Paper text:
[name] ([name]), in particular, is a powerful restriction factor of retroviruses that blocks viral replication by hypermutation of viral complementary DNA and inhibition of reverse transcription. The lentiviral protein [name] inhibits [name] packaging into virions by targeting it for ubiquitin-mediated proteolysis, and through ubiquitin-independent mechanisms that are poorly understood. To target A3 family members for ubiquitination and degradation, [name] hijacks a host Cullin-RING ubiquitin ligase (CRL) complex and a transcription cofactor core-binding factor beta (CBFβ). Here, we solved the structure of wild-type human [name] bound to the substrate receptor module of CRL5 containing [name]-1 [name], CBFβ, Elongin B and Elongin C (VCBC) using single-particle cryo-EM.
Author numbering:
A (entry chain J), H (entry chain E): 17 to 46, 57 to 112
B (entry chain I): 2 to 80, 89 to 96
C (entry chain H): 4 to 156
D (entry chain G), F (entry chain B): 1 to 176
E (entry chain F), J (entry chain A): 6 to 382
G (entry chain C): 7 to 156
I (entry chain D): 2 to 80, 88 to 96
RNA sequence: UUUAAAAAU
RNA sequence: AAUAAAAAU
């Protein structure tokens, strides 16, 4: 019930299939393993965090918390989002 | 419900769990992935070993500590707090 | 569109109201005395020439009840809206047909005359859905899904 | 006979918020072209004894009506919340009420400029991004990570005075 | 700054111009004067406060004045003061409520307010607040009035950097003053004292000492095939005796009425009936103008009711017929109409109506005379 | 040949205080008649390389001269106090410097209206007193009980903007 | 009269005391530059030099007599002299304060750029100055405006 | 070296000769005892306070203290001042 | 120096004294008027009897406590009645 | 309300009137634009800031701009920014010093300030602050310039609520611009670039391409029968090429100089000597204008040191003769004068002066020619 | 003529 | 034409 993601640096995450369904690329791909050529470990963690947040508040329309971002990581986070169409 | 992140041996897992759930249920949840008995597994928080009998409330952690954008970070051990990558 | 309406009614939290038992209070003439407050409440309810206000404690939502003559013209009402006290000893029942975010809904409530407070709940409407204009319904349904992000060229 | 009644969800605000809304709408309608085409009906152009002002935003073939009310029944004892606001959506003879958040969402779909389609690839290439989104009220929803990252990289313009958003108009500072 | 000893001519002329509907006058100037209770003496204090109308409630000229006045009040604890305001804009709603609170707290100050324009005079909440602050005679008495030529000239004399010279009123000072007085009377729901009504409403054929014409008016609206009153629109007004600074030519009460009818922004798509009660019948010019106005505006109906028929030089018969051809019904008050006017337009203090001798006979005589006048042409 | 010098006492002040002094003096000279008769000589009307202005106050036969100075190195390291003030009292060729407080006292002896000789008589009669001392800085010394009692009985007028006073001009801020 | 005034009144915010004084020219420039410019100003006599009391606001300014021009011969003529001491410079300045003629005498240590200053009564020029002007000033400083009006 | 003052209400004060010398009436009158027909005891206390105040600060012209007064006492204090020619 | 007020039996004395002056010097000062030996007389502050040997510093009172416009208040006794002032 | 996206036409026409001496312009309007290094592209941000001159220092538009910029700069540390100010009044002394400090802390901000008028340009302390902010190259460059037709038009196009109307220059725009340009050149102590001096100042008998007159000046004052220099009065200026937007007939350097002299406020009771060094002799019209100016201003003596004789149609000889007769002393530049000009009015960077070929011979020949012209009549 | 009013500053 | 500038608001 979990999809395994391998960071380009050689780290491992696992995220529920429903969470990964939000990403078009992973949804099309899903085999139970995925390898990301360019996404670093921290960017994979951040996109997993985005999945977590969106799933938590996908349907709620009241008092949506903030999603912290940092300028230094924003560029590659946007690159990863584009690649994943998230 | 609160989200949690468990990291060990450069392996990471993300999950959601109830507030009142005890550490035994946490070990049960991670068992379905790591396929080992809950008994030997021991958790860690702030590099402090968590005994077999533990609960969230007793630990002092609250729903505010664990958030979708800021889950509680707890290590794991079997019978190393690896930092995340950098730019 | 009826199955989609039902699915959204059941699953999507659309307003501050959560489609559950919500306590409400009568807001009219608060600074006036309690006896005067309920006397005017009953007099307006019987006469029907004044507007009646109810506020939910936990939110800013209000139900403001306007006489139908104030609006410019009479509107066709396939359903019936009513506000009466006779059904109970001292309880007034309120029925309010509405259209919330494109889904037709019935807001039901009761108020105790003695304490000038009560409760309200929200229920799906099935009969009127077919009556409503399917053109406007589908156009609204399409419109409430589109996103301005990257929409244009 | 039994009385015929009409019911409406009347948001509740203080008078100062309504006056600020009116001022902002007028300014952005006449002095600035950002709200051109909006219609502002004065208090004497409605027979309703309680309507204070109607603002009509033509959403293409449809319409969105924001109505302020005077002397409402709330009669708050402090008087701090004696007036009110309401939002409605019209198309020919259809009529429905809308959320304040959904109201601005539907507003931003037409009028205020937002990030164009090419803004994703511009960030990839590093090319200057333009035009930028100036109406954050139109994206209160949980947007895609692409949009959020783009917004973080390049911050929105903060026009002065602020553009009119129903969300700001209809909120409860008293209880919060 | 906020306080100033006086103000320049330019700002005075730009801000105190009293057109009922002005934009761009976003500042409020409050020229205040304080005097000791009773006999006339030079003011113990007088200055000017400034404030934007959009600034926070604490920075408004009235709130600033009272904040200063509270501390100024703890030097002579046992003295009672009179305070006079000359303010370009009428106090806001919040300022009105807070002034009512402060004046109730301390019953040892008299407050008189003179206002150039009426800020948001069409707001129901503002009307309620003004009634609370000023209407009560038992409660806090805070008088409010419109500024006329005299008030503006005094403000020029004592609150302007006018190098010694004369005040030149702008174009339409009296017209604007009468419009604002009528509007304010409607808002505060003024009413005639019994003596004036008694001495002016009598139907005796022969009278003496009544050369000023009174009038009362009330609007009504078609809805559901029924007449529905508008408690908003009710009031009485008289004619202006010619004066140098006012209309050089005497302004008739009917003419003021006609000038004010447009202001109510009566909707064209609807139908209204305006019921007017007059002690004297309209004169020739007044009837001509009334008929012209009625003809031009086809969405309004008139209902005139006269107490004493006025026929001085015979010109009135032509005017009555022009009114009739216009479409304005004309009649004479019977006992019922007299009592209705007494109970609707007088501060009777709950007292009953006291008809005078030979009311019915004289009323029937007047009805016969009017019928004879109208049937024949 | 030994060098010659002129020696003056220069109370160091900051720019804003001198600016305000100039503004108040001009206002009360032109806008109001209270300071009518004062002469204000500009910066270009004096050959002195350092002078910045001069205020001449005719005290009967004698005269009082308040001077301000530019570009002195005397000012503090922070350079807050780059400017300075000085007061002289000249009669034909004779001259003598004056203390700021004594300068204010001398000023009050001529120009601003003060309590009349009948002020006390009217005070003990309970009737009105016209006019009243509008200049408090001119009575820096502790005076007769008559003045303290009468002033306690009736508050002095507060002119707006404040009347110009040397004591306020030369007051020491930081080194209190 | 003048002597009694000087001894009694402690007039003019200065009490004829040995007070700390310091040179303040060019506080921003470094110590050596300050000393060099102070020495040059003292010798050449074409610039201005200021001596400030440490804990107060008063300061004594020396401007070249040329700037104000219109020279007036002064008895006990002011001087800034370095001849008396190798390491110190002496300052003497006649003045008239609040109707009494005085001398200000001080000294500055060129190494520390500070020192002491004091005030001393002057007996000579007091009788030389015009009797009329001093009498008029004495009258003026005695009166009070209160209740003076008619 | 001390002059005696008698309060009309039945109270006694004493103040040095020099302090009283500031007052014209007492200066001309002064016998080593003074009786005042109208001045209450509190007013006598206030006037003695004024005497000491001015004797302390008659000469100093630097950082003079404020001399407290209250409006309710003002009229009687003024009457006492005018009587004493202070 | 400070200024002081001493009240006893509706008799009051106004005088100045040095800061360090001990109570013995105060008794000497009041001796010239009361014609009584210093030893038996006892002072009072806030209804607290003062020992024969007392000094300002030990007492804690300072020049700030006593002003010409508000001198230190002290009672006195012979061998206590804090009489307040009259009223309007 | 402090920030505005645009200002109204009355505001622009009232606050940006560039007369060197204006009162009642108590507000400082600061339009600004922020750009990045690289190809020209639309500004990242562009708005307006407001504030009285007498308000607290923290509210002046310059401090507000820098407070906003500090936070707005967090996003991109690596980025290097260009700032352009269009300010009605030039910054104050305290603001000038704090701006110097701010730019000193951040070496990645290049600031240009376009001023309509110069504020307190006669204050020595302000002059020192301006020199520290601008003249000193060790501190980060903060360029300052006066606004011309181009800058006013750019503002009117981008910082005003214009409805596609066209910019309408006021009466004396170019005159005031040139006065302010000369004053700012005086205050900032600009110097001639060596190439311009070498090309324009050669005294060779025949030359080609030089159609512009350069005029350096310096004033001196009588004191104790001695000439004391006014270091504040020292600078140079060139002629204005004819332009449709500026002067239709471009002004000669002499006319600009004579227009500036009245703004030095030279004292009437003293005596001044004004020495001018030129590359060309005055023309006929310039000669008459200078002669009239000298005749009317008896407290000014004029000395001219020319490099070459400008003769055309024979009127130049008459012009020189009348100029000499009016009282002015005319002579020719020799080696000493050339070296003095080089060391005074040129940015020599410590380098020495290199006399050109035939300098002495040409100087002697021109001296003989001038003697003949001035003696023959 | 017009301003329904922070439509500006 | 004049404003040396908080002489204004
Ligand atoms: Zn957008
Ligand atoms: Zn107000
Ligand atoms: Zn008439
Ligand atoms: Zn006085
Ligand atoms: Zn500034
Ligand atoms: Zn020429």
């Amino acid at each position: 019930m979990y999809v395994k993601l391998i960071s380009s640096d050689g780290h491992e995450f696992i995220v529920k299939r429903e969470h990964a369904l939000t990403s078009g690329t992973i949804k099309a791909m899903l085999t139970n393993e995925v390898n990301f050529r360019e996404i670093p470990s921290h960017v994979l963690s951040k996109v997993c965090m985005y999945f977590t947040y969106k799933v938590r508040y996908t349907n709620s329309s009241t008092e949506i918390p903030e999603f912290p971002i940092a300028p230094e990581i924003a560029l590659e986070l946007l690159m990863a989002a584009n690649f994943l169409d998230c | 419900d609160v989200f949690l992140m468990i990291r060990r041996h450069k392996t990471t897992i993300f999950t959601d769990a109830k507030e009142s759930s005890t550490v035994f249920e946490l070990k049960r949840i991670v068992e379905g992935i790591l396929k080992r008995p809950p008994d030997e597994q021991r958790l860690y928080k702030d590099d402090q070993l968590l005994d077999d009998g533990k609960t969230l409330g007793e630990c002092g952690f609250t729903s505010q500590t664990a958030r979708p954008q800021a889950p509680a970070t707890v290590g794991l051990a079997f019978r190393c707090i690896e930092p995340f990558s950098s730019p | 569109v009826v199955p989609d309406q039902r699915s959204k009614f059941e699953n999507e939290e659309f307003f501050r109201k959560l489609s559950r038992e919500c306590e409400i209070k009568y807001t009219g003439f608060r600074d006036r005395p309690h006896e005067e407050r309920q006397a005017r409440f009953q007099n307006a309810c019987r006469d029907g020439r004044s507007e009646i206000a109810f506020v939910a404690t936990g939110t800013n939502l209000s139900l403001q009840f306007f006489p139908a003559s104030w609006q410019g013209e009479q509107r066709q009402t396939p359903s019936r809206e009513y506000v009466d006290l006779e059904r109970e000893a001292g309880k007034v029942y309120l029925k309010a047909p509405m259209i919330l975010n494109g889904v037709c809904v019935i807001w039901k409530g009761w108020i105790d005359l003695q304490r000038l407070d009560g409760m309200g709940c929200l229920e799906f409407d099935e009969e009127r859905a077919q009556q409503e204009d399917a053109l406007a319904q589908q156009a609204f349904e399409e419109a409430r899904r589109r996103t301005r992000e990257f929409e244009d060229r | 006979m039994e009385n015929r009644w009409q019911v409406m969800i009347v948001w509740q605000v203080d008078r100062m918020r309504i006056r600020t809304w009116k001022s902002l709408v007028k300014h952005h309608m006449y002095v600035s072209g950002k709200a051109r085409g909006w219609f502002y009906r004065h208090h004497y152009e409605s027979p309703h004894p309680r309507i204070s002002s109607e603002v009509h935003i033509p959403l293409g073939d449809a319409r969105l009506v924001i109505t302020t009310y005077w002397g409402l029944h709330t009669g708050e004892r402090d008087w701090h919340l004696g007036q009110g606001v309401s939002i409605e959506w019209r198309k020919k003879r259809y009529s429905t009420q809308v959320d304040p958040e959904l109201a601005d969402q539907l507003i931003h779909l037409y009028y205020f400029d937002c990030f164009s389609d090419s803004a994703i690839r511009k960030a990839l290439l590093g090319h200057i991004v333009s035009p930028r989104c100036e109406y954050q009220a139109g994206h209160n929803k949980v947007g895609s990570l692409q949009y959020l990252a783009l917004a973080a990289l390049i911050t929105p313009k903060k026009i002065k005075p602020p553009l009119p958003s129903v969300t700001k108009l209809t909120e409860d500072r008293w209880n919060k | 700054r906020n306080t100033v000893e006086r103000m320049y001519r330019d700002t005075f002329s730009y801000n105190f111009y009293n057109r009922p509907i002005l934009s761009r006058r976003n500042t409020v100037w409050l020229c205040y004067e304080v005097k000791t209770k009773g006999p006339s003496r030079p003011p113990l204090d007088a200055k000017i406060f400034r404030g934007q109308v959009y600034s926070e409630l604490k920075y408004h000229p009235e709130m600033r004045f009272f904040h200063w006045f509270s501390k100024w009040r703890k030097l002579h604890r046992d003295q009672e003061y009179e305070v006079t305001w000359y303010i370009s804009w009428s106090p806001c709603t919040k300022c009105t409520r807070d002034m009512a609170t402060f004046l109730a707290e301390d019953p040892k100050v008299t407050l008189t307010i003179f206002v150039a324009r009426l800020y948001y005079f069409w707001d129901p909440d503002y009307q309620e607040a003004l009634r609370s602050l000023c209407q009560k005679r038992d409660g806090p008495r805070a008088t409010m009035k419109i500024m006329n030529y005299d008030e503006f000239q005094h403000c020029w004399s004592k609150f302007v950097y006018s190098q010694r010279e004369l005040f030149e009123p702008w174009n339409n000072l009296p017209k604007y003053y009468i419009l604002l007085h009528i509007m304010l009377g409607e808002i505060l729901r003024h009413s005639m004292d019994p003596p004036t009504f008694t001495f002016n409403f009598n139907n005796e054929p022969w009278v003496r000492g009544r050369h000023e014409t009174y009038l009362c008016y009330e609007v009504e609206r078609m809805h559901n095939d029924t007449w529905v009153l508008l408690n908003q629109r009710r009031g009485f007004l008289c004619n202006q005796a010619p004066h140098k600074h006012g209309f050089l030519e005497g302004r008739h009460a009917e003419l003021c009425f006609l000038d004010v009818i447009p202001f109510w922004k009566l909707d064209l798509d609807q139908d209204y009936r305006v019921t007017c009660f007059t002690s004297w019948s309209p004169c020739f010019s007044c009837a001509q103008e009334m008929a012209k106005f009625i003809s031009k505006n086809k969405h309004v109906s008139l209902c005139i009711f006269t107490a004493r028929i006025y026929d001085d030089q015979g010109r009135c018969q032509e005017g009555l017929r022009t009114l009739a051809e216009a479409g304005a019904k004309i009649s004479i008050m019977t006992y019922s109409e007299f009592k209705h006017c007494w109970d609707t337009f007088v501060d009777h203090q709950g007292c009953p109506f006291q008809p005078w001798d030979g009311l019915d006979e004289h009323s029937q005589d007047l009805s016969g005379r009017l019928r004879a006048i109208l049937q024949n042409q």
